[PDB]
């Protein structure tokens, strides 16, 4: 069974072996019911959260973000290829944004043809700075992070999950509220076909090069971790010397864990941000995160900076042995390494203790997934 990529989200479907069922209505009366009530275009906006249930996904979402960048220019031949994949195209080639020295169409120009009707939408790109709205360039965005669709044309802004995903106020949401399901149906397919074929030119990959960082970034990450180790050691000394005053409402043990977890959480955040800054505009990890197609800033930090603290039942790795987590540690070892803080990134690789503690943390997610499927299923049935 072959499916459009957009309907994968409403179905919660993937293509790693998922099987879907087909039911063929056997009469006109039931055939008309499905046609007039249950067709995918009529299902675009869900009443659960008054927003679209399907949007633009992995390749098209990552590519449309690249496509609508300010500096994307298309030659005459490239543009004519894309318009072949625009079913709603009127057949009129728009005047290029640049006429001399060479005729060049921008990506926004071509996307404007995809946008149906004359809808008007205001969105912000994921990387829109907060202080730009208060600055002197509110309506002329230096970063192209302000999305304005006016009269059905994308006049500025980079499109991403925020303006094309399954969120209220999305450009896809406006198309449904304004143009209806049939025109919105074509809007979905036209985005995919046009930008999928442009991605054949621009391309998109992910490799080792996107997991590396500058030696300066590695030193900053190493220094941040080294400082975090000393900070946890200092707190341990205070607790050992009875110099730690319990925070009101918490026991001494709870106070110590809060301080240690706060130190290590901040170190993970500081190392993560340090890794993110080092990433270039060409970085493919960042490309799929800014577009919202896949991954998050935490994934990037884990791959580059540090995996971080491993937790079991919301606590650091417990003393499964007698007062120690593993036979490789001394007893009463409350340092970050003993209790499951992974100071390495995935690229660097985990040490044997980190690998095992990381396996302990991963097992919790697997147990939850098995539990969540049945625990929530019973709730759904009883509610119905």
């Amino acid at each position: 069974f072959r499916l459009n990529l957009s309907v994968t989200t409403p179905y919660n479907a993937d293509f790693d072996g998922d099987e879907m069922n087909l039911h063929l209505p056997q009469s006109l009366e039931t055939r008309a019911e499905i046609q007039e009530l249950a067709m995918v275009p009529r299902m675009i906006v869900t009443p659960q959260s008054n927003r679209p249930v399907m949007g633009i996904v992995q390749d098209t979402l990552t590519a449309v973000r690249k496509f609508t960048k300010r500096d994307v220019f298309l030659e005459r031949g490239e543009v004519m290829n894309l318009l072949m994949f625009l079913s709603t195209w009127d057949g009129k080639v728009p005047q290029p944004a640049i006429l001399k020295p060479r005729p060049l169409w921008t990506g926004k120009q071509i996307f404007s043809l995809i946008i149906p009707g004359h809808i008007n939408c205001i969105r912000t790109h994921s990387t829109h700075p907060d202080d730009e709205d208060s600055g002197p360039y509110k309506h002329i965005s230096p970063g192209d992070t302000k999305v304005v669709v006016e009269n059905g044309e994308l006049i500025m802004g980079i499109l991403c999950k925020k303006s094309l995903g399954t969120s209220a106020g999305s450009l896809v949401h406006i198309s449904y509220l304004e143009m209806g399901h049939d025109i919105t149906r074509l809007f979905y397919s036209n985005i995919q076909t046009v930008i999928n074929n442009w991605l054949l030119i621009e391309g998109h990959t992910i490799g080792i090069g996107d997991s590396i960082a500058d030696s300066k970034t590695y030193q900053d990450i190493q220094n941040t971790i080294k400082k975090a180790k000393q900070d946890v050691i200092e707190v341990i000394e205070k607790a050992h010397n009875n110099e730690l005053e319990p925070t009101p409402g918490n026991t001494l043990r709870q106070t110590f864990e809060n301080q240690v977890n706060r130190i290590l959480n901040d170190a993970r955040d500081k190392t993560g941000s340090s890794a993110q800054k080092s990433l270039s505009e060409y970085n493919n990890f960042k490309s799929m995160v800014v577009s919202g197609a896949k991954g998050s800033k935490i994934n990037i930090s884990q791959v580059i900076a540090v995996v971080g603290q491993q937790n079991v039942e919301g606590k650091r790795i417990p003393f499964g042995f007698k007062h120690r987590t593993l036979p490789h540690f001394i007893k009463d070892d409350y340092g970050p390494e003993s209790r499951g803080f992974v100071e390495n990134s995935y690229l660097a690789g985990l040490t044997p203790t980190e690998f095992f503690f990381h396996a302990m943390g991963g097992r919790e997610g697997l147990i939850d997934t098995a539990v969540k499927t049945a625990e929530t299923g019973y709730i759904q049935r009883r509610l119905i």
Binding site: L5, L24, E202, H204, I208, M288, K294, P352, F355, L366
Partner: protein, 1136 residues
């Protein structure tokens, strides 16, 4: 001299190589079975009481010695012959060895004359034999000899062949016996509960559990609150809890000082004394041993008619049913008082907070029941039955005054069928008592891949039921390090419950504690019966297999002596655990089976006892006789169980942790041979597994079990129900050190693929894959699907028989629209004949009481060629035919493919070579995966393997992806790649195949090992359009193989209600499933009798036939109303 860090990596893998050269990978299976045959079977027969007959002449029978011959098969003519395992598989025989016993028969005729006759080697049944065990025919055969027998030398054995089915006993995980465990139940009425599961030595009559519990303080009262919490004991065979002090009185300790001396070893401690005061007051009424015994007897299993019977019964329970492991004799009351006091003492420490509560998830507190202990448990029951019927048979003859024939008294079916049935079905115990029989112990060995076969032989089953849900048993406990793979575990209801042994983990087979006890007595250990209770406080208790043997005043010297003996292998065998709890002043020694242990390098004075001379001797492992066992004899490596690991200070590596550095630990006792040994068989094939997110490692361990390859070298001779063989398996370009011992090179399950991580045409999105059509045209991931059909013709009944023949449409009653032309005259299709769906491969006709058709129809989807047609006699002597159909599976759209990092995906499209993107060299990727699969999954090991694979292919060297290896870094791999004229990060400039234009982004491309998974779309595609219906519900059948319909369940029903599609909902649930019509009486809503032929409708009960209404309802609704009517309910359908 000493191993320098520059040579440690080679040195440590020489050690690991020698371990696997000796032990193999199914050693736990084979060693456990060898112990059961060599020792347990003889012990069970010896331990059996002599059979005494008296009804006058007196006959005695004693079973002296056990003999076992080679696995033998008897032809229908009665000629014995050795049974080869391959013959057992083909002819569906059970691989069993005849069992013989020497029986001595002495008769006393009251004439002061004794006649003694011995029946040497009396046949008493057949024992299934584990393959490649000491008693298997393949034992001691060279690899050349195995090939001559059509046996794969790489086949590890460790499984049984029952009715031709390869059966593997899964290690059953259970809480350790004879050990006192204190647990706290939040909800229960007891604040704390100290249990002990006591079992006899050699695992006699099953374990007897005793609970010592402290009542919770929840109860509010002036008397209850003032006294505190009282301790009660839950003895076996007693309905109600018995106060603890009463049990001590029944043992023979009346005075409070005497009882407290067994519970409290230091009266100077007042806190513990106050804890037992409420218990003393509870039993203040009982002040005599006989009164206490009567009190316990009053609650006995059966009511006591008189006091004398009650006292006798109570003494019986305490003597043997209570703490049997402590003692089962009449003089063991003092020993049981001390142990019972220790249980109370342990409970008090838990209540006082002085000792931490025991952890059920700790594997020190766990035992794994392997084939031996499993088989021994069955054999004890069967042998008792054998003697029970021997007594019953001999009783009849001796009663009549005639002597009895000993051979005719023995029923050989008892042991032969009892052993066979338990292994055949997996229901553990008795067929009659299947209600309490443990299920899933025996499983058909998985032969999908060699790695899957190895994994199934090292599987561990948790005691917790799969249906039950509880996170804690499913969690990855700290104590699984080095013992259980932290990654290999199934996904779903069995997460964390089914486990796999770590690579070097070993399960103790068990040994007698007699040599240890004798040495302890010789050493300065004071016996428990000779000391005064006051001396226990300062001394350390000595436990051997959970039995408190005595006390010692110099624990440090004793432990050093014990450790020295075990390292020298003088009196203590290697698998014996010696644990000293310094804080608790206890030394625990364990010798029983089921303890999980792993070999560790011994460290003395921050120095490995392993030196360069050991490595040099191992390097010449052959033509030198130096092996792994010499390392254990030399005392440089020893086995450590989970309990002993708590007391071990262990160094991950010698190169770093032993060396002088910032002072962290200057007292190291042991060292890992290599940290990569924490992984099991399936996780050991993941390259760079320490660069992946942990769930990805778990997913690959599952996927690797489903990867096609060559599951066994002799697959051609085998006729398995399903078998997948890859045309061109390759060994991975990027391998792990551990893979050398999994024989993965010899039986690979994948191909090295040029993989580009690119967004090409949108056909690889959402975990989908683009495959190169031209590469597939060249045999890339081509595989064979072998399916075997077995049919047996059996004659059973007065005139009913089944035969192989071509059923003529006129002669035979039953018939189908299939094609019967392919069948030969003998009713069997011939090899080399193309067969499609709805084709008959076996022509079977059963005589009608003319004859019905039971012919075997080829699977509808299947379209192959008959490969082999084997005909023989099965175990029952009936003519037996197996037909293998061969179908070639070219990778299609929808076939699953995975890397070794949890990145599975179906093929979304196949492009030809010209359509694929190419490098400047003309290289096109065999596979294109979406970049969006990497970021969220964080399978960085996939990217490193691709980079390392590129270097390996260019350099010509198989890359090393062993997890915790500082010698390999991404920067190092990148620098190597630069030397071959490639971008150091594995990117290449690719050209669009459709236009030839350079792609703006450079594509990460390189060799990656992928594996074709068993799941092929053509085996899953299923369509239903008015098929057959089932008899009970008259609804579409179930299953793809039965042309069943898809279920339209409650959730789909609920979904269509929200849609408001009432008519479509009616189609699915009424019109498309089971449309039915009934006639209902109008006066009463009951279904009326309708005769459409006569057009007469009557309602028997209303005496009316004019007003009957036709009602259209689902057949299942009719069945419901009729079923409700069977319960006297009257569902009356009213049309008004």
């Amino acid at each position: 001299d000493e191993i320098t860090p520059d040579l440690w990596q080679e040195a440590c893998w020489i050690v690991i190589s020698s371990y696997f050269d000796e032990k193999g990978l199914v050693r736990q299976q084979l060693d456990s079975f060898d112990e059961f045959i060599q020792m347990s079977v003889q012990r069970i027969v010896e331990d059996a009481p002599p059979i005494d007959l008296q009804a006058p002449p007196r006959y005695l029978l004693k079973f002296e010695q056990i003999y076992l011959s080679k696995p033998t098969h008897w032809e229908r003519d009665g000629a014995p012959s050795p049974m080869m395992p391959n013959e057992a598989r083909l002819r569906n025989l059970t691989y069993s060895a005849p069992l013989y016993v020497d029986i001595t028969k002495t008769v006393i005729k009251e004439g002061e004359e004794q006649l003694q006759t011995q029946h040497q080697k009396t046949f008493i049944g057949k024992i299934p034999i584990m393959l490649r065990s000491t008693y298997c025919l393949l034992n001691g055969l060279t690899d050349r000899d195995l090939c001559e027998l059509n046996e794969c030398p790489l086949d590890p054995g460790g499984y049984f062949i029952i009715n031709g089915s390869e059966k593997v006993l899964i290690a059953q995980e259970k809480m350790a016996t004879n050990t006192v465990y204190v647990f706290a139940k939040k909800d229960s009425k007891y604040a704390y509960t100290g249990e002990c599961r006591s079992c006899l030595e050699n695992s006699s009559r099953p374990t007897s559990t005793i609970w010592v519990s402290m009542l919770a303080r929840g109860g509010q009262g002036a008397k209850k609150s003032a006294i505190g919490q009282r301790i009660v004991a839950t003895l076996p065979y007693i309905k109600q809890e018995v106060p603890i002090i009463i049990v001590f009185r029944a043992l023979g300790f009346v005075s409070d000082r005497d009882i407290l001396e067994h519970i409290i070893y230091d009266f100077e401690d007042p806190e513990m004394m106050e804890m037992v005061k409420p218990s003393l007051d509870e039993a203040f009424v009982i002040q005599e041993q006989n009164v206490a015994l009567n009190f316990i007897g009053s609650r006995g299993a059966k009511p006591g008619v008189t006091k004398e019977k009650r006292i006798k019964y109570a003494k019986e329970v305490l003597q043997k049913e209570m703490l049997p492991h402590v003692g089962v004799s009449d003089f063991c009351e003092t020993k049981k008082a001390y142990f019972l006091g220790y249980m109370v003492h342990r409970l008090l420490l838990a209540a006082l907070g002085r000792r931490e509560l025991d952890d059920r998830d700790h594997y020190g507190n766990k035992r794994l029941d392997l084939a031996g202990p499993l088989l021994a448990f069955l054999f004890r029951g069967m042998f008792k039955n054998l003697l029970k019927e021997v007594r019953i048979y001999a009783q009849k003859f001796i009663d009549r005054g005639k002597d009895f024939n000993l051979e005719l008294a023995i029923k050989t079916r008892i042991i032969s069928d009892g052993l066979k049935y338990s292994l055949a079905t997996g229901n553990w115990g008795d067929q009659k008592k299947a209600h309490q029989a443990r299920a899933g112990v025996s499983q058909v060995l998985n032969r999908l891949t060699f790695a899957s076969t190895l994994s199934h032989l090292r599987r561990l089953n948790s005691p917790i039921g799969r249906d039950g849900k509880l996170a804690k048993p499913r969690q990855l406990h700290n104590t699984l390090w080095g013992m259980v793979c932290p990654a290999e575990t199934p996904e779903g209801h069995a997460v964390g419950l089914v486990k796999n042994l770590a690579l070097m983990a070993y399960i103790s087979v068990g040994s007698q504690p007699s040599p240890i006890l004798e040495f302890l007595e010789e050493w300065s250990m004071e016996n428990l019966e000779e000391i005064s209770p006051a001396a226990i406080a300062d001394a350390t208790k000595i436990f051997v297999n959970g039995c408190w043997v005595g006390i010692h005043k110099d624990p440090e010297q004793l432990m050093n002596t014990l450790r020295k003996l075990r390292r020298q292998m003088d009196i203590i065998v290697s698998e014996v655990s010696m644990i000293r709890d310094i804080r608790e002043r206890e030394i625990r020694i364990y010798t029983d089976a089921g303890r999980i242990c792993r070999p560790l390098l011994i460290v003395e004075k921050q120095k490995l006892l392993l030196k360069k001379r050991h490595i040099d001797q191992l390097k010449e492992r052959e033509y030198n006789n130096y092996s792994w066992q010499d390392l254990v004899a030399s005392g440089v490596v020893e086995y450590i169980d989970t309990l002993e690991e708590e007391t071990v200070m262990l160094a991950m590596t010698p190169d770093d942790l032993q060396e002088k550095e910032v002072a962290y630990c200057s007292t190291y006792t042991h060292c890992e041979i290599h940290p990569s040994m924490i992984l099991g068989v399936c996780a050991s094939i993941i390259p760079f597994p320490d660069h992946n997110q942990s769930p990805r490692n778990t997913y690959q361990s599952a996927m690797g079990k489903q990867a096609m390859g060559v599951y066994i070298t002799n697959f051609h001779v085998r006729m398995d129900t399903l078998a997948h063989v890859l045309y061109y398996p390759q060994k991975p370009l990027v391998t792990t050190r551990s893979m050398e011992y999994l024989r993965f090179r010899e039986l690979p399950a994948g191909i090295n693929s040029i993989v580009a991580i690119a967004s090409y045409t949108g056909y690889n999105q959402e975990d989908s894959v683009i495959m190169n059509r031209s590469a597939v045209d060249r045999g890339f991931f081509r595989s064979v699907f072998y399916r075997s059909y077995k049919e047996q013709e059996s004659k059973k009944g007065f005139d009913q028989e089944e035969v192989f023949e071509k059923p003529t449409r006129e002669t035979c009653q039953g018939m189908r629209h299939a094609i019967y032309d392919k069948l030969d005259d003998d009713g069997l299709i011939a090899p080399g004949v193309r067969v499609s769906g709805d084709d008959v491969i076996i022509g079977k006709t059963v005589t009608l009481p003319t004859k019905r058709d039971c012919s075997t129809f080829l699977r509808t989807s299947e379209t192959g060629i008959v490969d082999q047609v084997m005909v023989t006699l099965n175990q029952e002597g009936y003519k037996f035919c197996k037909i293998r159909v061969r179908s070639v599976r070219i990778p299609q759209i929808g076939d699953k493919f995975a890397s070794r990092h949890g990145q599975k995906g179906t093929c979304g499209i196949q492009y030809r070579q010209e359509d694929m993107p190419f490098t400047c060299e003309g290289i096109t990727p065999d596979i294109i995966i979406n970049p969006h699969a990497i970021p969220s999954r964080m399978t960085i090991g996939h990217l490193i393997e691709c980079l390392q694979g590129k270097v390996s292919a260019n350099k010509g060297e198989i890359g090393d992806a062993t997890p915790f290896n500082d010698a390999v870094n991404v920067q190092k791999i990148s620098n190597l790649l630069s030397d071959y004229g490639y971008h150091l990060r594995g990117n290449e400039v690719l050209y669009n195949g459709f236009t030839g234009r350079k792609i703006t982004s450079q594509i990460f491309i390189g060799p990656t090992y992928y594996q074709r998974l068993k799941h092929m779309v053509d085996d899953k595609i299923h369509s239903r359009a008015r098929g057959p219906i089932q008899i009970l519900n008259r609804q579409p059948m179930e299953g793809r193989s039965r042309d069943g319909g898809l279920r339209f369940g409650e959730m789909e029903r609920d979904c269509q209600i929200a849609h408001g599609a009432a008519q479509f909902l009616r189609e699915r649930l009424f019109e498309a499933s089971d449309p039915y019509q009934v006639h209902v009486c109008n006066l009463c809503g009951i279904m009326a009798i309708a005769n459409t032929r006569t057009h007469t409708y009557e309602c028997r009960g209303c005496r009316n036939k004019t007003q009957i209404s036709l009602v259209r309802m689902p057949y299942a609704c009719k069945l419901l109303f009729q079923e409700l009517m069977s319960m006297s309910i009257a569902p009356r359908m009213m049309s008004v």
